[PDB]
Amino acid sequence: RFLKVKNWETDVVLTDTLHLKSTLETGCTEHICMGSIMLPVRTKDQLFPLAKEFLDQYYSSIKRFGSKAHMDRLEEVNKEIESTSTYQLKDTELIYGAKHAWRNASRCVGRIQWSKLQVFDARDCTTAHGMFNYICNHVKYATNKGNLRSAITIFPQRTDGKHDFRVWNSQLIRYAGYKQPDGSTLGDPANVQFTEICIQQGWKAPRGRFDVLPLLLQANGNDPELFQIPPELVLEVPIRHPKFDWFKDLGLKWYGLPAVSNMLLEIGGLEFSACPFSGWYMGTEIGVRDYCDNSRYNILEEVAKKMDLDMRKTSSLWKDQALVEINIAVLYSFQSDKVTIVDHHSATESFIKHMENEYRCRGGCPADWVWIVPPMSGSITPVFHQEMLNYRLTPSFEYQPDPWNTHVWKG
Amino acid sequence: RFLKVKNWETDVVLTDTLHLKSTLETGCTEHICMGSIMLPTKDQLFPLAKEFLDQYYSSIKRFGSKAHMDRLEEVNKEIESTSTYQLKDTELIYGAKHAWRNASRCVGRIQWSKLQVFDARDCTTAHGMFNYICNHVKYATNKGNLRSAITIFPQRTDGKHDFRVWNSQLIRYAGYKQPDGSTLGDPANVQFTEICIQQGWKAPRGRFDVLPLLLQANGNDPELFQIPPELVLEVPIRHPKFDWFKDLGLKWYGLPAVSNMLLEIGGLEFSACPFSGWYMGTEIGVRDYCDNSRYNILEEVAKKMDLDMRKTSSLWKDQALVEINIAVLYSFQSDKVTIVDHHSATESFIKHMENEYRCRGGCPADWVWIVPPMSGSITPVFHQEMLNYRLTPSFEYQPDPWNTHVW
């Protein structure tokens, strides 16, 4: 079967065959679409077919499908599974798997970059201190003094689910949030729960509005341990506006390195529960979501007051006016400090080229419109007008429950 | 199977049971989501009629009543006999209001029960259709105090006698391809502007020429009619800050009146059912004015604003986009023509959703269409999980008539 998608701005039509290789389920049925739903201990039984399919993919990509190297690897993995109940990926396979998990990430607009991913193998790590060392090296490498480089660090895979490696931080670099007795929040409201865990674990909170959270690292299923990222490794950008001199006095900054650390990396049926990865920011992630979500720093009103817009009627679009200026400031500040950032116009245009290229060389590109379209100025970006097909391919990044909800404490 | 939708800004969780009553298919499967795809006999009829009559009599709290069973029998008699049936006026009004209520792509559904339904099922000619449409337009426009309305022409019989309005909207601006190479007026209507000229129309070849109506009654060739200009309420677009905005020469019409959809009630098909409400500001300012395939004024506006258009990262497009949409709202509000901004309309829809979940068990909703085309995440609908499913009565798409008309 074949499936067509149309760009309604350009009339370019693309044909998807790649969805045929999709096995995992979407959440939708013939009778309900769950496309806007945020989120809709594995035995040898199901593992060898997952390994075989991955190794077929791997050896096909290197033009060795059916070779003796391919057949020998299949044999070797089979015997390792039935004898040890799991198996170890070769370095080349791990790198391939991590790159393709990114390539397959249908919610990621930044995938044109997928093949230039730096993969750090941390599968020999055994302790939380070792994890901290690997993560520091990741941050330093990825940050590269502002010339950001994509990277992923891969800690040992799950064994029986009782010895998991986990990074308890949702991102490697994030600001604390503190609930005050008067009901207000200081810092990032998204991080109040995690901040409280850190404090309970012994973290001495500075209780400011932009406190970089400590790392909370769990090795081999043991209780997690606290570590402070060396401050010289945390590149931050003070936010100023190119026309509004009062904007700096808002006291805003952000960190340069977006580094997601709570997802699970699935490769050939193996589960890597700690696999922090990093790229560089699209400006709206900070300017629209981090700063202007009502549930986050929520600076629209203070910015709009300082711009002296008509704030009495929403049809003045004072929120839309302030939002644009804030996002101009974020982009101006990062570029002025020579920290890598991409605006949503450039990013979505690159994604369309990537997607067309993927349809030609690969037969498709799974894409989640709900997430790909940026959270401001949607229809003046080319992705808004692009039909997209969403389906799940493996290798993949998956969500996993927050570890404090599942962890068995040792004491 | 009893599904939950979460609002991630407010943590409000609603439980949807209405989707289990859904019948038609979404285009999605368990292996592939098509949420962003724009367009995915005697025996079939009686279950359709039964399903509809059942919900009608339930809604008036007469389920399982004498009148319910009688009407079920009478329609059953009529289908066995005539191979179709006719709706009572009460059922027709109910069916049209619920077609709107069920329109999962419509953000303006909080108004669904205040729809004025005009029964035009006695219409037989295109001149009669024109007359009904003029009355609709005058009633709906209401000197700028817009009122929702639908006019329902006779239902399909054998598909040879269809009533169709060939316009996609009752009021739209013409589109002309220049010898110079580009497009004058609305590029989206270049083909329809051709079919009007290629049928008799005499075009002013301006930038904002109201298109004539092309009306097809009973399957005959469609006929041209000019809507009386005094019935077409237009708003000149000015900005409450930039005096040069007026010189751009922009205007738009006040009445959004979709005329090319098909209304399905109880299995009966109404191929000509123009309906109208009032605009959300972004439909004009974001889509009509700033789409690259439409009037595409962003460059000229940014030029007049003297923004740095060298690099995309100056967000000059975004800045211009905001000012254009401030002016649209300002112009309509100043001329006392009903319009709603995207902030108000999406707040209304969240309120509508909670109402529908409370009193009905759910609300089918298409996030890809509901979230406005600018400033998405500062509107509450962006953070609202939505379930999309197809209920009937419904409005459906249908092929353009010129691709079907046995001429």
Ligand code: HEM
């Ligand atoms: C290189 C520059 C990159 C850019 C500009 C970028 C951009 C984005 C953005 C804006 C999102 C939306 C998520 C949100 O709004 O919270 C996203 C999602 C995602 N990205 Fe990328 N990304 C980049 C690199 C990467 C890398 C290196 C990886 C993995 C190796 C990755 C994997 C993903 C995944 C798995 C998601 C799904 C998010 C989720 O489901 O919550 N991205 N990306």
Ligand code: HEM
């Ligand atoms: C009264 C104020 C109304 C507002 C503010 C409103 C708003 C909207 C908007 C913004 C859209 C998106 C369509 C697009 O972007 O092209 C839409 C779609 C739609 N509206 Fe409403 N509308 C209103 C009244 C009505 C009425 C009276 C009906 C029918 C009786 C209706 C039926 C629909 C349908 C069927 C769609 C989706 C059609 C499609 O798939 O393109 N609307 N509406």
Ligand SMILES: CNCc1cccc(-c2cc(F)cc(CCc3cc(C)cc(N)n3)c2)c1
């Ligand atoms: C509602 N989000 C909850 C949630 C939970 C767990 C993970 C994520 C998440 C996952 C991602 F891969 C990406 C994001 C955006 C942050 C981000 C990451 C990267 C690598 C580049 C970029 N430019 N930006 C967020 C989000």
Ligand SMILES: CNCc1cccc(-c2cc(F)cc(CCc3cc(C)cc(N)n3)c2)c1
């Ligand atoms: C990409 N659209 C293609 C297409 C084709 C056929 C019909 C439509 C369409 C259908 C609708 F019910 C509504 C619209 C927006 C116009 C509109 C209509 C009404 C009643 C109120 C409003 N405020 N606005 C457009 C759209």
Ligand SMILES: C[C@H](O)[C@H](O)[C@H]1CNc2nc(N)[nH]c(=O)c2N1
């Ligand atoms: C309800 C909805 O699915 C949710 O708000 C999504 C919408 N699209 C998004 N898109 C991106 N990139 N990031 C997000 O967090 C979200 N949130």
Ligand SMILES: C[C@H](O)[C@H](O)[C@H]1CNc2nc(N)[nH]c(=O)c2N1
């Ligand atoms: C491809 C995509 O489905 C298409 O551009 C849609 C996106 N969402 C939309 N939403 C609304 N309200 N109106 C539209 O025309 C569209 N177009």
Ligand SMILES: [Zn+2]
């Ligand atoms: Zn779907």
